[PDB]
Amino acid sequence: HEHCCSEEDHRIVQKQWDILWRDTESSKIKIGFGRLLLTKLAKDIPEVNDLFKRVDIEHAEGPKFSAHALRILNGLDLAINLLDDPPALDAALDHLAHQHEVREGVQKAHFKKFGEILATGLPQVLDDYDALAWKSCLKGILTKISSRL
Amino acid sequence: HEHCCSEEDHRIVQKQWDILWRDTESSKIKIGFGRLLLTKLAKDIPEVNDLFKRVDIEHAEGPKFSAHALRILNGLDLAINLLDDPPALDAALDHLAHQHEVREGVQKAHFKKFGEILATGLPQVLDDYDALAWKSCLKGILTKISSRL
Amino acid sequence: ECLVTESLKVKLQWASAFGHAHERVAFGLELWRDIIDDHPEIKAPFSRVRGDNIYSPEFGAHSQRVLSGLDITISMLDTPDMLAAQLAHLKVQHVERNLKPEFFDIFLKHLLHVLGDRLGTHFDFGAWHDCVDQIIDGIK
Amino acid sequence: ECLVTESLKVKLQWASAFGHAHERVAFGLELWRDIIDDHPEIKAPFSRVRGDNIYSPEFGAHSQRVLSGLDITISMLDTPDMLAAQLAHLKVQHVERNLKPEFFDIFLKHLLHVLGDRLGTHFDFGAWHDCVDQIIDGIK
Amino acid sequence: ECLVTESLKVKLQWASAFGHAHERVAFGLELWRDIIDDHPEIKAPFSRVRGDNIYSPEFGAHSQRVLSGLDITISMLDTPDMLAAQLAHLKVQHVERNLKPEFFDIFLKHLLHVLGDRLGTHFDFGAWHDCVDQIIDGIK
Amino acid sequence: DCCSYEDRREIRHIWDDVWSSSFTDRRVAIVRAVFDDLFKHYPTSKALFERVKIDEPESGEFKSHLVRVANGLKLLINLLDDTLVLQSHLGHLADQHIQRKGVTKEYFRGIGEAFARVLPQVLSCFNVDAWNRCFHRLVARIAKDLP
Amino acid sequence: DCCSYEDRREIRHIWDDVWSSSFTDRRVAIVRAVFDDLFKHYPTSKALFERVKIDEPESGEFKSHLVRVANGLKLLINLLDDTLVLQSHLGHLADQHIQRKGVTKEYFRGIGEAFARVLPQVLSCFNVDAWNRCFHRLVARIAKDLP
Amino acid sequence: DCCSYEDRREIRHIWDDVWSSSFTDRRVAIVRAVFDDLFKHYPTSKALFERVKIDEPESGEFKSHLVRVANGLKLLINLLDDTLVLQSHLGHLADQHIQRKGVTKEYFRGIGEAFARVLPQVLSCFNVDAWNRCFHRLVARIAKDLP
Amino acid sequence: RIRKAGSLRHRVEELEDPSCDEHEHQCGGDDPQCISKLFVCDGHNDCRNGEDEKDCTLPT
Amino acid sequence: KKQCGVLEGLKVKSEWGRAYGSGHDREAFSQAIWRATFAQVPESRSLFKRVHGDDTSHPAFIAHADRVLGGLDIAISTLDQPATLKEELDHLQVQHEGRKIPDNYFDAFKTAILHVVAAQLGRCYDREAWDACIDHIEDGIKGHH
After folding, report:
1. Quick one: closest CA in E to H77, which residue?
2. Preceding omega of I29 cis (within 30 degrees of 0)
3. Nearest residue of B to residue F23, measured between CA atoms
């Protein structure tokens, strides 16, 4: 209810997250942004580089990774776009939990960090950003995704 | 040609030609303007001076000519104001053709010039002028008026 | 002098720009403010009409009286016999007193700047410069 | 000092002009921008609050803190015991640091210029000049 | 250099500010006016494009041509291979001819001032300064 | 007397019909026609304008004058919405006539009659009374000063 | 936890009822009434304000203080819509209290209780919970710096 | 002859679909695809652009060029509502090509055909005729001096 | 009488900022409900009401 | 039929942007599509027994649907550039390979998408183009062969 992620709250997030996909070259953006986001993660926590090894994170611009950049960044999209349908969003995220559960090496502390990074990044590409609303929602998402251990 | 002097085209012309008659002293304007228009014609082609001899063009400010200045300038008005009724406008202009046919000395090249002059003059009194629209309409008019020789 | 069209153009644009009633005081005010901020030396002769506080009614009155005269000259322009006379009349009201000639060159600079805003891109700078100029020299 | 009316007038106009919430930040920003463009020498002491980038949150914060104090003083003034005290309090926060005296004369120039835009022709320049001035001197 | 974001930011803001059709001519005009009033020395080289009357079509055309090029550079900007090329191309159109160095520093000053008005407080001064600067030097 | 705001509005409109032509021709003929009525009734006043050459009706030195008078009236009317300023310029307008030796309190009451006889002929829908009312308030303050 | 946007709106209004008048008078009495409740509960803190002369309630040297406190709070609330700036000034507000020797993390939790007991008396329709929530978020960040 | 206003509006829109985002990527591929059609039909012209390095398609020295061309067209279209200015820059655009030795009146009629074959493929709802009409008026004048 | 009255109803349905969207279809009626114009006449029922299936006649 | 190409890609990629949309339009867009699919081949409901395929309106399935379109998004959106698309398709290829899914169903699902998209875009929509691309995307998932 109050605790979790308000209608207005996400209605906001959703609106602000859309400022991004106004131009058809979403790929170039999603990639570049997701690329940077993951990079800046491996920067602060290297034990990550080995996890993303499978997707050739070594080559940031390498298609292998660029594709990945999308998948993840695009997953975040899914999460955000289902914010207005808790049961669905729930299911959608639970699924993401399982996709991370079987990937050993990935620990909670990783998400906590990725969250802080994401929160410092968004406001750099979006002129209109409501830190409070976002933090509220991103938390709920990141948590439910890593919930499965 | 066919395309041109479209509805929008003349709707424009009409609107812009009205900017002129906002003040009650239309006479002073029409005269001065028409006076100048004919003068500048005799300037570039003198064989004209003899045609307008009948109306004492020699005395630009002379009532004899001032009256004329109106008649003509006022005829152009009629033309413009009938732009939205082709059959009527047609008839109205054909009539003008005949009034010029029996006036020997008046040749086509005269109108072509008067047109160029008119096109350089209008934009000097009208702040809002759409050269394209006007040229399109003035052409149709001037042509039909002289088309009978 | 000026061209018979180059006048009508100004006579016309002046209408839209200047305006009516309050719309004018606003114009006058905006004008003098820009002028005085650029050259505070002017607050001097305007001492009689509280030039220190341009928002005051005393100055406001003045402001209007001025623009009005400008209106006359401009609507004067169109017919030469009246303008030539009006201008001569203005020159007298000025010659006696001493002024600095450059002040007017300033006034003009702004009057155009302002009309520029009011009228937009349609503003026929050429016509005005050529025309209002002729009104300034006469007074000076 | 002020007059009693000359104050209420300002106290009142300040209300409409300053505004509420965001409307303020906008005011502050517009103000400081005009000030810094006129005298870039000021970007110096504002080094602590990113004065180079006035649009930054660091400076934005500052901007607000400032205007707020101005609000206080303006509110203060009518009741003398509080003003005399508040003013004395401000003098201290200034005396210690070295500053340019003329900076404030500048600040004032713009604060009026801006309120001028916000309030329009109703803006009681007289009242403000006479009143805000008193607030500057005490500080300085 | 610049940052990839610091570009996208400008590329984006330029969009809203510049605009489309007439909205642009208005921008260009407003820009050049402010520039020429500040440094009338510029009316000189703009002699070919009636720089005396910025409201004229001759100049208006120019005005646009300019902004357009600025659009290109900005649009080039993000992706290095195109920028490096575009910039080199601009340098040539300039080197041949005399221009003052400081003129551009002026142009920039205003371009930012104007975008400031258009965009408001959101205007990312930092991003622009860092970014448009690079465009000026190269041509320069 | 006092006048009423509605009446001011009435006039602020009635005028826009006489003034209305842009430039001089019209306003001239009207202001002239007004004076001609002043002189036909208070011939004395005529002499007062030798300075502007009334002996040369089409002079221009005089026409310009007529205009200045017209415009001075225009300025008044176009101030009826800004009371405080009107009240001042209205005074200034008096002083400009007090220093004009020979101008009686009467001549004014006379030109007032003038308009009230001319205007109703140059335009229709003229609220003679409304005009008269606000014109008197204007004249009174102009004239009054001189005494 | 966090602050909802609705809650912000609630406060952005609740405040407009305490602040409202231009006058010091009101805000003063309130902020004072707040402190009086802080001192009646955590009397130790009283001493901290000898610098502003609390021994002279009507001093003015002190009244002005109260106002500054009030206004400092006002500034906070009126920043709730600009997060990023609030987050910074919120820090700056901490530092101004960390350098004030003698200010405990407790005294803050204490002044918090103060408002929650005062405000509900100076105005009706006070969402004590909503206030409490966002006030804590504000205090937490202020205080924390100190220890 | 002069172009119909409706048609201009049609194009002023049709263009907004090809120009599109502020991105180079798109506009590039299109303008390129346009030239490739010009070269496949009037291969002679190819040589004219060695100055910009057409031998290096992905060069960037060339890509930038393509953009300038694109933008130059954009500038034209976005001027169709300001006639007088268009008429001037349109001339200036001619002079920039007259001083380019080797540019025929033909190559232009050729690039005109190019768009008319490309555009209808990059976007739907393309009024080929309307485009053709106003594009010719633009081209004619650009050549126009040149020959 | 029916149509004549129903006709009147329509005139009213036209007034106002509309319940449903331009795109969306207003089921009715007692209780409003908005479904897509694409959305009826799926063959699944949108409507309690059953509009997506009771309007017996194809205009065309 | 149509094997797909750069422009036809850009077109679908763009049109998809409009048809996909967001928020509720999405939750429905997907809904509509699945209803159209299942209506064609009721047999297929049995495959989504795990995610409440019995009731298309059940949150579990709503998620599933919204989740499926998600991939299709990446596909269409990626596809413009061959380098990346290649990868995404390959990735999908894996998540599918091993598992029998008849070409019969994919066909219906395509039809579904097409009909709904057409219903959503009103007038500006090239059928052939979509057909061609949805195909290329599906092929990349079947491995077809």
Report:
1. E21
2. yes
3. B25
**H: neighbours with 3+ CB pairs under 8 Å?**
A, B, E, J
The distance between the two most distant Cα atoms of chain F, rounded to a whole number of Å, is 41
What number does CATH give the domain J1-145?
Answer: 1.10.490.10
Q: How far apart are CA I35 and CA I30, in angstroms?
A: 15
Reported structure resolution in angstroms:
8.1
Q: What technique determined this structure?
A: cryo-EM
A12 has a chain J CB within 8 A of its CB? no
Neighbours of F66 (CB within 10 A): 23
Closest listed residue to residue E68, CA positions, set F21, H70, D107: H70
Write down the number of H helices and E strands in chain A: 6, 0
Helices E125-139 and E4-18 sit at what angle, rounded to 10 degrees?
A: 90
Q: CA E83 to CA C79: how far, in whole Å?
A: 59
Q: A25, H20: Cβ pair inside 8 Å?
A: no
**What distances in angstroms separate CA C107 from CA C112, E71, G30, I54, one per listed residue?**
9, 37, 55, 78
Distance of alpha carbon H147 from alpha carbon H51, whole angstroms: 23
- Report the run of H or E that residue I35 belongs to, with start and end: strand I34-36
Vertex H121 angle, CA H118 and H126, to 5°: 95
Please give the backbone phi and psi of residue J99, each rounded to the nearest 5 degrees, phi first. -110, 130
How many Å apart are CA H30 and CA H17, to the nearest integer? Answer: 11
3-state secondary structure of I34: strand
F and E interact (at least 3 Cβ pairs within 8 A) = no
CB contact under 8 A, A91 and J64: yes
Report the distance separating Cα E77 and Cα E70, nearest Å: 10
Specify the CATH number for the domain of residue H134.
1.10.490.10
Determine whether the annotation assigns residue I25 to a binding site: no
Q: Are H39 and H46 in contact (CB under 8 A)?
A: yes
What is the set of domains in chain C, with CATH numbers? 1-140 (1.10.490.10)
* Token pair in block for residue D20: 């509420």
Q: Do F22 and B28 touch (CB under 8 A)?
A: no
Distances (CA, A) of F55 to F51, F52, F60, G140: 10, 9, 11, 92
Q: Would you call B124 an interface residue with chain C, using a CB distance cutoff of 8 Å? A: yes
Residue ranges of D for the binding site for heme b? 48, 65, 89, 93-94, 97, 104
Query: Looking at beta carbons, which residues of chain C come within 8 Å of E37?
Result: 113
Per CB-CB distance under 8 Å, the chain A contacts of E5 are 124-125
A63 neighbourhood in chain J, CB within 8 Å = 83-84, 86-87
- Structure-block tokens of residue I6: 């129903």
Q: Where are the alpha helices (DSSP H) in chain F?
A: 5-18, 24-41, 61-77, 83-98, 105-122, 128-145
* Tokens coding J121: 């875009």
Write out the two tokens for F17.
Answer: 């019909």
Handedness of CA E45, E46, E52, E54 (dihedral sign): negative
Residue D57 CB contacts under 8 Å (≥ 6 apart), including other chains: G82, G84, G85, G87, G88
Question: Total domain count for chain H?
Answer: 1
Which chain C residue has its CA at the smallest distance from B128's CA?
A: C122
Residue extents of the structural domains in chain J:
1-145
Name the residue range of residue H101's domain.
1-147
D2 cis-preceded (ω within 30 degrees of 0) = no
Q: How close, in Å, is residue E98 to chain D by CA atoms?
A: 29
Which helix (H) or strand (E) is I24 found in, with range?
Answer: strand I24-26
Q: What dihedral do alpha carbons C11, C12, C13, C18 form, nearest 10°?
A: 70
Q: Which of F84, F137, F75, F94 is nearest to F112 (CA)?
A: F137
Interface membership of F24 toward C (CB under 8 Å): yes
For I36, list phi and psi in degrees, rounded to 5: -65, 145
Judged by CB atoms closer than 8 Å, whether chains meet at H5 and B9 is answered as yes
**Is there a contact between E5 and A127 if contact means CB atoms under 8 Å apart?**
no
Residues B62 and H103: their CA atoms lie apart, in Å, by 56
